[PDB]
């Protein structure tokens with residue numbers, strides 16, 4: 001796991017379960033190419049998006065589909081998604097955990113980056 | 117004037133209105149002595165807590181009574197209150213705004229320290 | 233007037249001054265069309281981005297150029313920018329303040345939606 | 349582990365290592381009695397504070413000594429500590445993770461509460 005996504009619900013104090021996550025990588029023509037996707041587990045975590053081989057240098061966007069998550073709980077939230085955009089691996093491979101804490105009208109995101 | 121408190125509600129996307137706020141100063145015997153208090157306004161703000169003359173260097177605690185705010189909304193909260201504890205410094209900027217962003221199981225707090 | 237942006241620096245406890253901010257609207261072909269932009273003031277605020285007349289319902293993106301802000305400070309940051317993506321609604325309150333709290337490896341964003 | 353504390357550094361994007369944490373429990377006479385203490389590990393986590401037997405109903409305060417953490421990194425931060433105050437186990441035993449995200453002039457805290 002060079003890339004993990006962890007999502008928490010700040011209203012319930014719980015993992016945010018079954019939240020859709022789409023990862024994109026900026027292509028040579030400046031467009032966002034689909035890179036990987038998945039859903040968070042019971043623990044609010046999404047493992048296995050990629051491999052150290054596949055996860056090369058680049059600019060990556062992690063789009064967490066928070067609006068669908070709130071709507072299913074009966075809540076009409078402000079944001080369409082939480083986006084996280086960053087350059088990865090530009091000094092060598094690292095392991096990235098992208099953490100998102102969700103409320104209906106706010107979210108935070110935090111990266112924890114470790115040298116493998 | 118030298119100390120303002122501002123409180124926002126991350127669930128409703130609004131000022132947190134009618135939130136009790138208690139300020140204490142630490143006494144020489146290490147106890148907390150009541151110093152000032154009030155309730156946030158319609159804009160989620162509490163002004164007028166103290167004066168330049170009274171707000172001398174020392175250790176202060178700002179308690180924000182968050183549990184009663186969520187209970188009034190019928191939302192089950194985790195914390196009894198949010199506490200913000202700091203040392204007032206004369207060398208720095210002259211105005212302290214303590215901002216607090218509230219969710220039922222999370223809060224953040226940020227000090228913005230400026231020259232007025 | 234209907235859309236304000238406010239940015240704070242959690243490392244220095246200050247407004248984040250001179251931060252570029254770009255607003256886009258989503259077009260019918262699903263692309264992002266430039267809509268408005270500016271730089272935060274000394275108070276970390278950006279006013280005057282749009283008018284009531286122009287700010288019709290639709291999907292908007294607010295990009296806050298955080299990486300250039302940290303680089304100017306000599307602090308190595310994680311994100312390229314902070315994006316805030318939302319649907320403007322006429323049924324709700326009439327003013328949207330997008331607040332962003334910045335740290336090098338984390339940010340939060342909160343929408344405060346009020347009647348002016 | 350009915351009680352875990354996890355601390356992250358938002359400036360470095362890393363676990364906050366060797367941070368002192370003191371837990372107190374409100375006594376019958378309304379005073380704060382020492383309950384447990386420890387330091388965060390390499391992973392920014394502090395396990396083993398208590399047991400399900402020892403961790404009875406009550407009002408608990410988790411004091412995270414963030415000022416000492418920043419000072420050792422050369423930073424003079426705003427807060428003396430991050431305090432987290434909550435009622436525990438009042439509907440039966442639960443498992444509590446208290447997470448704190450630290451910046452020099454801001455912090456957030458979030459509880460994740462699971463029914464064992």
Ligand SMILES: C[C@H](CON=C1c2ccccc2-c2ccccc21)C(=O)NS(C)(=O)=O
Nearest residue numbers: 131159160213215228238329331342344346
């Ligand atoms: C515009 C403001 C919300 O944002 N302002 C913030 C502010 C002003 C001074 C210091 C810290 C903060 C802050 C921190 C986090 C989120 C918003 C704000 C707001 O709530 N508007 S109102 C109707 O006057 O209450």
Ligand SMILES: C[C@H](CON=C1c2ccccc2-c2ccccc21)C(=O)NS(C)(=O)=O
Nearest residue numbers: 097099110112356362363390391392447449
């Ligand atoms: C990479 C991962 C970080 O996990 N991040 C969490 C986080 C970030 C922001 C807010 C809440 C949480 C959280 C809560 C529970 C468990 C993990 C995390 C982690 O394991 N950190 S480390 C290397 O052991 O120090």
